[PDB]
Design a protein around this ligand. Structure first.
Ligand code: ATP
Ligand code: ATP
Lengths: 432, 433, 435, 425
């Protein structure tokens, strides 16, 4: 492995966040998508960013729909330092009221085209994966590629679930397809050994699917967005396929690592309960070499009055009273009162703590303090930031609902997952 | 409403008395400079004074320590018009066998401090737990036009006999000291804490004020006192201060109010550490929305617990807890507690790094005992310094109940009944302490 | 002796008004957001307000600007990115000058929801094209002590200079009770006041019986939301409409006297004079550097300036210049400037260059018959503003003999405003051309 | 490289010690802090090269601590760092300096230790230099500098085999031993027409040592040595260790003495290419940002000179000179063939008045002075009508009590030296 010029001074990271589907609502109701809490100590945005930094990419642009003081403070307090690097948030619009990937990038082509760089690293979507973009860049160069598309291998089963690419002798992408049913699926079968897989697993996974992350030569992208296809919206559907029709060197690169998508409540839910996996969680946030970074907070060590946790992870600066936590992920600052039970749940915690004087007024006012009230029962749920769950609240959804837009009540049910909205106040005794 | 003009940042220099040799806090100091001794699961002593200075708006700070340490330099380096530099008297991680007093350590570097264009020097002992905004303290030093201002800690007769008591006049000016006075000498030190603005009731119970290693000194005064006046004084506030007073210099007292404990003793250190899990609320809390205690950003992941039962305990960052019972203890960063373990009344300083599966399967094929508390162990009333490789079935419970014990070879010490396993130490399986 | 509490850092948000379409400083603003315009040889306009904030202890700063530019972004990134920040809030996200108008109020209102996300007590509103230094704290301190809703920095002046500003009338306590936009005749005469009321002596108060707003305001957070969302949702001008209206509602709009140099540099003529002004003798009315509150800028690490044979009178030389055998009189020479053999620079502002062209490059340019960046051989440039990366060819004489005053020749690389010739950025004027 | 330097290589800069060769420049400040090129300090050379080489771990060994030296380092420069390690507890060998801190260096988990000793202007990507030490399974790769003969015999030399391996060391060898040192630099890198022109390789004082190796060489194999050059490395070779050589051909000019120093400085003003520029499109020499204003010039006629930052120049002439930062030059003064270190700050017109009515001169070149072939240090106060011209073309001398010291005919005014009006030199 060796890139020259150095990636740090020759590559520009462009993360496609913000602009995304409301597939994560209500989590994206009162906040920029990139800012969505993850793993109890992190935020979605921290993944591609950390990967960029760990991959020696120091020039990072975070694309988003609108501006967030929260996103900034997070990115500013955790990365604003890396020299000659930077991590700037570029926002699509001027307000949270109301795009298309290629559109997103094109909007700021005027800014992008200013940096002296060889390639643009286009990272889009929402995934939990650990990649070293460097090897991916090297391939892009050692092939005089104009566009190098990262590809995920898969057997013909889950193959008709994604968009498939076809490669020639050299691995040059020659054709595309969206869930080719069956009569025309086999046509997409290529022998992936050409991309680095061993005959064994290549015969198992004879299909390649776009991963939604690319490397494009500084000049190509400018020409593609600015001239060849100025009216396109998405990349993996228009630009990429179109640059192919023009006969450009569109190369494939195979990623054989962990890759879990999390653009939906269920996927996200399950992804998060994933680090409580036995005996080894397939994805680990911490890594001796390529760890995921976050905002330094200087929170105290979690306190535990009399808790009986089992198969769960606990975030920083927690205050936990006598209770029972099972198979769950407790976010930072999370307060859990007496006799509470938490099961297969993701408690995102809080952004700040409330003092005793505070819990004092709230009481006299008859309101509920931040946290899980006394003797509450939380099952299969996501309790967003600053939730105020009153006493005796039971979130068990016994009738087993699957859809509910109970916003006014501070919640939402999707795929059977109850999700207490951020800053929501769930009154004592309420059952769900 | 009142501010330091000029600002603390550019007119004050922090001089932290990190420590020297670490005789008192041994074995914790063993080949580790005192300022770096692990504190409250995620911090190090040096964090308190430094943090207090940063929050107090003092960005220029030095840390004197008889010997140096690799980690102290890594901590400060990574953790921190400002700077934090270590000024060692001996560039060796080895515990010095020669003595160096505080005025010695300070005077030895007086020449470098002189190079700084500041009005005062803030002399702080890096051995106590507590929070303080030195801004008013300094503010006071200037408004009272004193040569040296001394922080005063009020206390009752009982606590009084183990401190350096001051006697002030009606204007708060100090005019006489007494080192750990008793009998009649003590009686003669009774003062009217009212003068310093103390509560009238909290005054009847605490008619004594003690120096507390906190001082503000005008530049010139310092150079004068250490160069001309007392060039042979070893102890700073034990001689140099009382000495200044006796020369007619303006030595004013500034009443200090709040939690304050000296933690240079194994017992004192122990206590203050387990004192963070005091059922109601710890009298001292590292966290503070306004002035928190800073430490090194480690990016450790959330602590995992397979089947734990924690009571009156605090868990640091990135711990890996299997099935076990943790009671009234402190668990430092990267701590590994194995299956069947039982922790009672202990302070686990944790580890400096995690051991991988490679070192695992290796130390498992050759048998060696990995870092952490081995299976079915039992640690009662102990301190387990960093990277302790504790075999399985170990029972650290001081059966014979020995107060003082020095078995540095077997990998540990014992003080006031506290079994402190030495850093890096290895206690073979079955061992019983 | 006394300071804010809380301190400006956590309780004061800085909102800067970098500019609209920059139609006044054209062509210096041609495809360049106003905040970015090169200033004083080694700075950009935006450095004045941002630096005043930082030096006043204000770490949370936003910069408003109708459009955007790469340079503004790169600059703020490098010079200040380092709980503070200096983010740009643009109306239009393109470098193209907006052909549509937007006001200072429409501007702020547009992002009020963002400003709304900041737990601050006040909003410091600063214009972004005024040359001056100021410790905003005491001024904010006044806003809190007098429990005002809006405090307006006031500038004393004489009848002659008053007619070009927005004047205000104060009562005995200094509470503003009236406004008048660019008042003249008896309209003006009624705006006379007693300056001693704000702390001026009687000698100067007699010399300057007027006080004009100067685009500096402190504003309680909610007074802002209320005024912009409810009380005047249709206002476009923040200072000539929204303020008076708030006054007209009986809100506590208090004045605060400003002492010192202050100069508007948003028009060409004034921009020219202010920039040339640092060459003043025996001293400059305004100095960029200062022991305690300097005007910051991006660290470039450029090498010291190189001079082969320069007869330089009353001038300023920025970082990394390359002068040969020439004459530089009463001029400002920007960073990376390249003045050639036998050149004569009289009374001009050389913006400089964004980069150095290597020998090789010069070879290609010569072979293609083009001009390298910089003032060419035997060039005579007087009373002009030469924008960044200009390629002035050999023997060019920008001397405007026909004494023209206004001329729009954007196609030839220059506009003439008030007799001041301005060469557009990256312009190229061929050998022997006389302007 | 892989792992990369940033994380696998530690930087150890040595530039303290006596180095008295530079008296009185190093009289007060530590050696690394010596002013340079109008806007720099010696230390910026080896530290800048490191950074531009992706070397983050950087230590700087100095005889003693310096308030101004650390401010310069902190202000100018999250895995990397640049820390100063003092050898003594007060300002009143070389293998010893490294050994003394082995305990500190030992802890860092790296693969190599870049050692940089001595002071001299030069730009080099230590990366290709480490890539070498790695592919050649070297345990110590030494800097190889080719040269003719007048040079070849002046410095120690290295004989290599047909693998680049170093087998011998000869300190200033002449005659038949000098001949037994010819090597044909074809192996190192240079071609045939270049090599023939210089078949002699001399060590530079820069080496790449494998982490462990250096730990063994300093505490075991040779815990009583003083120099890396003539003792540790030569011995290290004899003991039979893979000691390689690394060719380096690029502007190399030492500056350990006033004359070398002085000449290198004025050298940056030499016509065409000065041989060495601090700035560079790729790897520039970094320095502390002072936000100094542009330089004012009332009526200066300057020739073949270079103006540093924030200078306040009145009526005067400047010839073949290098004016440092904050230089205040007065009317009628004439500066030629000199180097002005500049000044560390400015004095207000209100502060100056307090000088006249005190019988003292304000920092900077007073009125109608005449500076010829001299080095005027920082904060130098030179009253009206001074004439540092060295009339009786002396050479060496000494007049500490007279704010100056003469060496190689160069009058070097001590930092803060107050030279009264009318005096001459
Ligand atoms: N030689 C030394 N250099 C630096 N710090 C030291 C040295 N000796 C002790 N210290 C540390 O300095 C601080 C002051 O020591 P100590 O608690 O004895 O203060 P004291 O008795 O109030 O006053 P003094 O030490 O002047 O007599 C403590 O935090 C201690 O660990
Ligand atoms: N759309 C805009 N966005 C940001 N700044 C703007 C905009 N339009 C003008 N500006 C800037 O706003 C300032 C104009 O305000 P100024 O202090 O001159 O007061 P004014 O012109 O008398 O009244 P008003 O504030 O209503 O324009 C200038 O600094 C100008 O460049």
């Amino acid at each position: 492995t060796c890139l020259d010029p150095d990636a740090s001074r020759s590559v520009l990271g462009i993360i496609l966040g913000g602009g995304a589907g409301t597939r994560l609502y209500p989590l994206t109701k009162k906040r920029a998508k990139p800012a969505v809490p993850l793993g109890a100590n992190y935020r979605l945005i921290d993944i591609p960013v950390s990967n960029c930094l760990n991959s020696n990419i120091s020039k990072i642009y975070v694309l988003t729909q609108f501006n967030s003081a929260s996103l900034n403070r997070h990115l500013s307090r955790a990365y604003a330092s890396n020299n000659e690097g930077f991590v700037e948030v570029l926002a699509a619009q001027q307000s949270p009221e109301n795009q298309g990937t290629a559109d997103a990038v094109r909007q700021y082509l005027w800014l992008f085209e200013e940096h002296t760089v060889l390639e643009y690293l286009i990272l889009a979507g929402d995934h939990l994966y650990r990649m070293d973009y460097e090897k991916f860049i090297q391939a892009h160069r050692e092939t005089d590629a104009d566009i190098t598309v990262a590809a995920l291998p898969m057997d013909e089963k889950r193959a008709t679930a994604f968009g498939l690419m076809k490669i020639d002798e050299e691995g040059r992408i020659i054709e595309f397809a969206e869930k080719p049913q069956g009569e025309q699926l086999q046509a997409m079968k290529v022998d992936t050994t050409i991309l680095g897989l061993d005959d064994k697993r290549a015969k198992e996974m004879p299909f390649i699917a776009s991963m939604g992350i690319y490397v494009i030569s500084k000049d190509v992208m400018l020409n593609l967005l600015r001239d060849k296809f100025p009216g396109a919206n998405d990349f993996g559907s228009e630009v990429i396929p179109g640059a192919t029709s023009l006969g450009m060197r569109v190369q494939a690169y195979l990623y054989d690592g962990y890759w879990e998508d999390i653009g939906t409540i269920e996927a996200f839910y399950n992804a998060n309960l994933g680090i409580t996996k036995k005996p080894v969680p397939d994805f680990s946030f911490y890594d001796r070499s390529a760890p995921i970074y976050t905002q330094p907070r200087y929170l105290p060590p979690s306190k535990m009055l009399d808790a009986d946790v089992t198969d769960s992870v606990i975030g920083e600066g927690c205050v936990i009273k006598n209770c029972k936590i099972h198979h769950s992920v407790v976010g930072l600052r999370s307060c859990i009162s007496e006799g509470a039970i938490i099961e297969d749940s993701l408690l995102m915690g809080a952004d700040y703590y409330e003092t005793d004087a505070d819990r004092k007024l709230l009481a006299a006012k008859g309101s509920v303090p931040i946290g899980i009230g006394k003797n509450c029962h939380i099952k299969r749920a996501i309790i967003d930031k600053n939730a105020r769950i009153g006493d005796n609240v039971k979130i068990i959804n016994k009738d087993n609902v699957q859809e509910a837009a109970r916003e006014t009540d501070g919640y939402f049910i999707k795929s059977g997952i109850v999700t207490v909205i951020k800053d929501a106040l769930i009154p004592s005794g309420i059952i769900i």
